[PDB]
A paper describes a structure:
The structure provided superb electron density for amino acids 265–342 of [name]. The domain assembles into a concave four-stranded antiparallel β-sheet, complemented on one side by two α-helices. The β1 strand forms the central part of the fold with the adjacent β3 arranged in an antiparallel manner, and β4 and β2 contacting β1 and β3, respectively. As in other [name] domains, the [name]-[name] domain is assembled by two repeats. Numerous contacts are found between the two repeats. In addition to the hydrogen-bonding network between the β-strands, hydrophobic interactions play an essential role in linking the two repeats in a single compact structure. Therefore, our results do not support the existence of “open” and “closed” conformations as a general mechanism in [name] domain recognition, as previously proposed.
Of all [name]-domain-containing proteins, [name] is the most highly conserved across bacterial species, which underscores its important physiological role in bacteria. It is predicted to have two domains, a catalytic “double-ψ β-barrel” domain (DPBB; Pfam 03330) and a C-terminal [name] domain. In the present report, we disclose the X-ray structure of the [name] domain of rare lipoprotein A ([name]) from [name] ([name]-[name]).
Numbering used by the authors: 266 to 341
C-alpha cells in the first residue's frame, strides 16, 4: 500500500488536530508516527495504506481542497 504525509509537528496537539481533521476528508486510515529527529520529537501525520496510485492523487486533491497541508508520498 501507498502512504501520504500531510504534516509534521513538534507539538502533539497540532498533530492530533490535523489527524482529526483529515478523518473528515478521507476514508483511509490516518495515524501519527512520532520519531526522534534533531534531539526533539517529530510527530508526523500520515495516512494509508492507499490501494492505488489514482486514489492517492484524488486524496491529495481532497486534502488541498480542505486546505489542510501539502500531501506528499512517503514510504514508512
Amino acid at each position: 500500500g501507498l502512504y501520504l504525509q500531510v504534516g509534521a509537528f513538534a507539538n502533539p496537539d497540532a498533530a492530533e488536530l490535523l489527524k482529526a481533521k483529515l478523518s473528515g476528508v478521507t476514508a483511509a486510515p490516518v495515524f501519527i508516527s512520532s520519531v526522534v529527529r534533531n534531539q526533539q520529537i517529530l510527530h508526523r501525520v500520515r495516512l494509508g495504506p492507499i490501494g492505488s496510485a489514482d486514489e492517492v492523487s484524488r486524496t491529495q486533491d481532497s486534502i488541498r481542497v480542505a486546505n489542510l497541508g501539502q500531501p506528499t508520498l512517503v514510504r514508512p
